[PDB]
Every structure is written in structure tokens, then in C-alpha cells.
Design a protein around this ligand. Structure first.
Ligand code: F3E
Length: 154
């Protein structure tokens, strides 16, 4: 019992784009752009669609970088998050009622204001490593247990 989600990081040589979510699940945290995958849509097509919806940016080629499964204790459905990166975008990041994008220098990534799992796998993303992860949360702040391993094929 898992549900597909996407997460996209626009990662350029000296900066990364994050978005501050204004409402719903994850509100108040910086994160990549993503969401649920639709019926009849490929995971990558869903990732591209969500990037546009939430940031205003058009991506063509997305690179698979990771898969992270999230368990929230007391919730039956696991979240199967497919993580992608891109360095080539078109458009200017757009702030909306749902999302405030901002560029960050790589030495200023706002980990204290991100989901806590990001502190484990974001350093792999920055060094161009691919990974498979599993994080068991209690609520939205506490990691009870986790696994995270580098892989050659996502
Ligand atoms: N970084 C991070 N950590 C935990 C959960 C998520 C998430 C990703 C896609 C959709 C909803 C939540 N992202």
C-alpha cells in the first residue's frame, strides 16, 4: 500500500531552487517541487507537470536521482517519492498563493526549515549520487528509524 509522488530539485552548479509551501501537507518548509502522479501519467510526466504548476518553470530532461519511501506511523499509506534533478530550466520562478520559490547558494541550504530527512540525502544529491531511502516518521518532525543507501540504478 504505497502512493506515488514526485519531487524535483532544480540544481545548478552554485545554487538550488527550493519552494516554501504555503498550505497543506508540508506547509512552512522549503522543499523541492512535486506532488501526486495522476492516472495514465508517467512518473516523469507528473514530475514535469508539478514543477510547472508549483514554480512556473518548464523542464525538458529530468534525471532520476533517488527513491524515498516515507512511512508516517498511524497512517496506512506509504509515500513512494521519486526524486529528480535538472540543471536546465526555462521561465522565471513564480510566486503564487501556494508556493514561494527562492534560489539558495549551496552553502546556505536551509536545513532547519526543511523536512528533517533532507539532511541525510540532500548531501548525496549535491555530490551527484543516487540513492534509495526509507524514513519512518512520527508526526512531521521525528525520524524514528531510517535506511539510506547509494545505488547505481534508481
Ligand atoms: N523532503 C521531503 N521529506 C519528506 C516528505 C517529502 C515529500 C515529498 C513529496 C511530496 C510530499 C512530501 N519531502
Amino acid at each position: 500500500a504505497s502512493r506515488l509522488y514526485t519531487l524535483v530539485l532544480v540544481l545548478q552548479p552554485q545554487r538550488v531552487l527550493l519552494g516554501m509551501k504555503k498550505r497543506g501537507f508540508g506547509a512552512g518548509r522549503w522543499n523541492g517541487f512535486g506532488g501526486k502522479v495522476q492516472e495514465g501519467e508517467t512518473i516523469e510526466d507528473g514530475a514535469r507537470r508539478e514543477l510547472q504548476e508549483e514554480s512556473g518553470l518548464t523542464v525538458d530532461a529530468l534525471h532520476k536521482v533517488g527513491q524515498i519511501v516515507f512511512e508516517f506511523v498511524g497512517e496506512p499509506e506509504l509515500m513512494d517519492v521519486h526524486v529528480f534533478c535538472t540543471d536546465s530550466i526555462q521561465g522565471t520562478p513564480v510566486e503564487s498563493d501556494e508556493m514561494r520559490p527562492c534560489w539558495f547558494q549551496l552553502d546556505q541550504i536551509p536545513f532547519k526549515d526543511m523536512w528533517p530527512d533532507d539532511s541525510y540525502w540532500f548531501p548525496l544529491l549535491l555530490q551527484k549520487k543516487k540513492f534509495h531511502g526509507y524514513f519512518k516518521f512520527q508526526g512531521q518532525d521525528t525520524i524514528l528509524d531510517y535506511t539510506l543507501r547509494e545505488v547505481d540504478t534508481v
